[PDB]
């Protein structure tokens, strides 16, 4: 692998036959600088310092169009060779040390994602969770696989347990990584 | 059933070393998880990584205007964007939260950049073993986390301290624990 | 502000 003080992607261009769907992101030292919501035609920043930059969402749609063409050409070249489904590695951990009655964020790290199409839902005590749930985009890896992180802003209780339900084609049954204080 | 999917990836990768001095551009052309062609600024031309690479690599090598416009991105994309990084992402200094909780673990919470140095001291004395440090945990919200477990024996009259060094701190952050 | 890498087109 290439050894460097800082590594950056300007940017991560992604396109797939499922949907079809696209993704445009910029990365700096493994962190997502921003993404472009192709459906909404909007640039979404992930650092308040970066938010004042003017990145036109058109420039993302414009590059993905070349990827759309290139994929068609390589489907014809590979004699239509589909992507292999990978088994993802799920890890659940808190943002800060666990303290009862103090605000903390639960982090679900879904590593080794391929193809980049996955469902990451949260469960508290079996029922589903919609409130306080946020996630990142598909972050690039050197092995050209992905990883996505899902957050959960919560207050921890003595009897409150939490589960991270992950649905992927590489999995026969939805994977559940349990968490408890 | 397994849904049929064909993936294509393009990555414009810049590698920065010793600040502005060492700069490298690598544009990777990937089909599924197979990188078939890449341009490397250090190499000077597009290259075929796999047998699916020559129809792309040769085609882009035949035209001087394709080579010139690609070769230009070492300055128009890497060096250009690094000047923006120096003002934004490279200035980002988030100081860590050091806590000791029970054998004994030093929880170093939410910091930026990644560079860190956690050390346990027995009584103004180091402690090399038994130290079980977790890898550098990436939280994805531009903060890092690192947990260091220490196997101790609680003995009379010893103070256990966790020494943590980071570029956001002018002096190391020290947190102590007693039996 | 930020600049991007433009992907080359296949045949």
């Amino acid at each position, epitope marked *: 692998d290439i050894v460097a003080d800082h590594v950056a992607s300007y940017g991560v261009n992604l396109y797939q036959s499922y949907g079809p769907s696209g993704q445009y992101t910029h990365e700096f030292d493994g962190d997502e600088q921003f993404y472009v919501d192709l459906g909404r035609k909007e640039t979404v920043w992930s650092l308040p310092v970066l938010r004042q930059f*003017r990145f*036109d969402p*058109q*420039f993302a749609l*414009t*590059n993905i*169009a*070349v990827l*759309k*063409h290139n994929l068609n050409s390589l489907i014809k070249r590979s004699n239509s060779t589909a992507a292999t489904n990978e088994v993802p590695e799920v890890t659940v951990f808190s943002k800060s040390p666990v303290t009862l009655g103090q605000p903390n964020i639960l982090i679900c790290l879904v590593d080794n994602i391929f193809p980049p199409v996955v469902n990451i839902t949260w469960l508290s005590n079996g029922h589903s969770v919609t409130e306080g749930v946020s996630e990142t985009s598909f972050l690039s890896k050197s092995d050209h696989s992905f990883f996505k992180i899902s957050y959960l802003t919560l207050l921890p209780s003595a009897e409150e347990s939490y589960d991270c339900k992950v649905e992927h084609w590489g999995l026969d049954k939805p994977l559940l990584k349990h968490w408890e204080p | 059933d397994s849904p049929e999917d064909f993936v294509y990836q393009f990555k414009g990768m810049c590698y920065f070393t010793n600040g502005t001095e060492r700069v490298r551009l690598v544009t990777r052309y990937i089909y599924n998880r197979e990188e078939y062609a890449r341009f490397d600024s250090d190499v000077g031309v597009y290259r075929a990584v796999t047998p699916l690479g020559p129809p792309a690599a040769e085609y882009w090598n035949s035209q001087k*205007e*394709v080579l*010139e*416009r690609t070769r*230009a991105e070492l*300055d*128009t994309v890497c060096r250009h964007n690094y000047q923006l990084e120096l003002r934004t992402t490279l200035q980002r200094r988030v100081e860590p939260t050091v806590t000791i909780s029970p054998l004994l673990v030093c929880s170093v919470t939410d910091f930026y950049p990644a560079q860190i140095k956690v050390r346990w001291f027995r009584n103004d004395q180091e402690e090399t073993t038994g130290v079980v440090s977790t890898p550098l945990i990436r939280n994805g919200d531009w903060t890092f986390q690192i947990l260091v477990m220490l196997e101790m024996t609680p003995q009379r009259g010893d103070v256990y301290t966790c020494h943590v060094e980071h570029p956001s701190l002018q002096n190391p952050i020290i947190v102590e624990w007693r039996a | *502000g930020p*600049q991007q890498s*433009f*992907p*080359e*087109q296949e*045949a």
Partner: T-cell receptor
Framework: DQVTQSPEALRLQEGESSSLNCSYT??????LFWYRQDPGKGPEFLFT???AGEEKEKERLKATLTKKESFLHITAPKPEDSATYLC????????????FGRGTSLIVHP | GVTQTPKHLITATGQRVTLRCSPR?????VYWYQQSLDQGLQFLIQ???????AKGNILERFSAQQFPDLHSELNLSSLELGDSALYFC?????????????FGPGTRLTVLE
């Protein structure tokens, strides 16, 4: 986001070397293009410059790019070089749509 | 490289004309330009791989299209005396920031009363 060419028109004598200016105030430039256009004919491509400091050459022509402008140095011009020299810019400011200048009408007297 | 048909076009006001342009082999982007004495080289519309990419200060009467063979058609309806101009076509590889435009010989339109 504008591009400006000076002079609007130029009158030169055979051999009298001069320079055509192309000033731009657009942001995030990714290409500067110089063209040669004859009456009724389509614009003939000359040079591309991708960044400031670049310099390209084609016989008696020399195109240079700087952070503020681009110069098309025409050395020892002949009456054959009588055309309208067009300048265009492709930048983030102008959504990369080519913004052309009003050209410099060149006329070289024998 | 870039070809254009017809070369000359003499027509009347109110008529409809269709302009054709075949781009460079390998180029997937086509641009349309109107050149007149008082307005200069003005961008009309752009295409990429058969889909609309960009719209300029084009009129409602003016319409365009890029076929699967990647050639383009600029249709000009309810023609006015002012429409008398040089209509150039341009071709680009991917239609991105670093792509060089290559022009065609251009159709020359003359609209008379």
């Amino acid at each position: 986001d504008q591009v400006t060419q000076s002079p609007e028109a130029l009158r030169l004598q055979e051999g009298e070397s001069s320079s055509l200016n192309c000033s731009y105030t657009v942001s995030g430039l990714r290409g500067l293009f110089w063209y040669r256009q004859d009456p009724g004919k389509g614009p003939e491509f000359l040079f591309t410059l991708y960044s400031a400091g670049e310099e390209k050459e084609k016989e008696r022509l020399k195109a240079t790019l700087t952070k503020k402008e681009s110069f098309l140095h025409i050395t020892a011009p002949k009456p054959e070089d009588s055309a309208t020299y067009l300048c265009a810019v492709q930048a983030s400011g102008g959504s990369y749509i080519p913004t052309f200048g009003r050209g410099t009408s060149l006329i070289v007297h024998p | 490289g870039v070809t254009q048909t017809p070369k000359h076009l003499i027509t009347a006001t109110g008529q409809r004309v269709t302009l054709r342009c075949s781009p460079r082999s390998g180029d997937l982007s086509v641009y349309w330009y109107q050149q007149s004495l008082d307005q200069g080289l003005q961008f009309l519309i752009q295409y990429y791989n058969g889909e609309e990419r960009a719209k300029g200060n084009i009129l409602e009467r003016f319409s365009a299209q890029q076929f699967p063979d990647l050639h383009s058609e600029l249709n000009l309806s309810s023609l006015e005396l002012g429409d008398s101009a040089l209509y150039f076509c341009a071709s680009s590889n991917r239609g991105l920031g670093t792509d060089t435009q290559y022009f065609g010989p251009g159709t020359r339109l003359t609209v008379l009363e």
